[PDB]
Design a binder for these strands. Structure first.
Ligand SMILES: [Mg+2]
Ligand code: NA
Ligand code: NA
Length: 323
DNA sequence: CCGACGTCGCATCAGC
DNA sequence: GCTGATGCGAG
DNA sequence: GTCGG
């Protein structure tokens, strides 16, 4: 932090404005990359030129850093921050299911605040209402102790519906993280393959029957997004939580797990490495690239380890897949 | 100079 | 009613 | 906005 935190906040703020106000998702990711890279740099950045050396920090961000160091502020940001229209739009997107477009329409027609949304239930789609209901809870983090508690429930109820199911809670949770943002469960069964009833439904149903799943954002044959909660002790109720459960075919499961285990940077590397070794990994399958680039049949995979074999890597533990 | 920067499931909107 | 686009939130 | 063909 305090080393170059002034700078990473500036860049993260600018990132958020590009995403929500300007609708420039690529400039959003540029500032985000620039932020991460400076955040890892263990020296108090002395000038914009110094920063430029780092990947993802270019001319225009070197300039902003120079201005910030010299003045301790950045004129464009100070100005956007006082902007009534924009700071509202930026804010409203914090409601889950409200993106840059819905937040634009809203601010356009007066609606700017949480109370403004609360007064206009009838202009919110279903996702948005749930988002408003749980705005506070959703911006909280999930402590790993609750994550374990949550998992206990998920693994118990999945098994109770049919013992042949496999459920794996992935995400940063799986990489040993102290806290999580939501839960992502990857679910498969022997009767579901690429060449292959209600398998997702029955599990949601049962998580609902024991009152773990409280609300549904969206649900189809393969992906469920919704809300969940741990039950009460006399002690204060637990916050409501985002949970995603996805149903993957068995032959694509361990690719699924690898992929949704991450981290984003770790997959970015593992794809680059598997490349030269003559393989293409995606979230679904690993395939061999033939002489000119033509990817052939997907190789069978029966554990995460199989993938690591194909590309001559030693199976790295989820605990060490930070990059 | 100029295009990639993942792509996808699902809910909901637009067009027909 | 149907089909395709667009919005959203996820690596 | 940054990078790179
Ligand atoms: Mg049985
Ligand atoms: Na640079
Ligand atoms: Na949102």
């Amino acid at each position: 932090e305090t080393l170059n935190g002034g700078i990473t906040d500036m860049l993260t703020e600018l990132a958020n404005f590009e995403k929500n106000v300007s609708q420039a998702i690529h400039k959003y990711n540029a500032y985000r990359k620039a932020a991460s890279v400076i955040a890892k740099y263990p020296h108090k950045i002395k000038s914009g030129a110094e920063a430029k050396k780092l990947p993802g920090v270019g001319t225009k961000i070197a300039e902003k850093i120079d201005e910030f160091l010299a003045t301790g502020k950045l004129r464009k940001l100070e100005k956007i921050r006082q902007d009534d229209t924009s700071s509202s739009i930026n804010f409203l997107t914090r409601v889950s299911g409200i993106g840059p477009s819905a937040a634009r329409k809203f601010v356009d027609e007066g609606i700017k605040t949480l109370e403004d949304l609360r007064k206009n239930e009838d202009k919110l789609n279903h996702h948005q209402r749930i988002g408003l209901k749980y705005f506070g809870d959703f911006e909280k983090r999930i402590p790993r102790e609750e994550m374990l508690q949550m998992q206990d429930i998920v693994l118990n109820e999945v098994k109770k519906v049919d013992s042949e199911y496999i459920a794996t809670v992935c995400g940063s949770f799986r990489r040993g993280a102290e806290s999580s943002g939501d839960m992502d469960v990857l679910l498969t069964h022997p009767s579901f393959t690429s060449e292959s009833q209600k398998l997702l439904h029955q599990v949601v149903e049962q998580l609902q029957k024991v009152h773990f799943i409280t609300d549904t954002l969206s649900k189809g044959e393969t992906k469920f997004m919704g809300v969940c909660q741990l039950p009460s002790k006399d002690e204060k109720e637990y916050p409501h939580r985002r949970i995603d459960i996805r149903l993957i075919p068995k032959d694509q499961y361990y690719c699924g797990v690898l992929y949704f285990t991450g981290s984003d940077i770790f997959n970015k590397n593992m794809r680059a490495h598997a490349l030269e070794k003559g393989f293409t990994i995606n979230e679904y399958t690993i395939r061999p690239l033939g002489v000119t680039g033509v990817a052939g049949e997907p190789l069978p995979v029966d554990s995460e380890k199989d993938i690591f074999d194909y590309i001559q890597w030693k199976y790295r533990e989820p605990k060490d897949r930070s990059e």
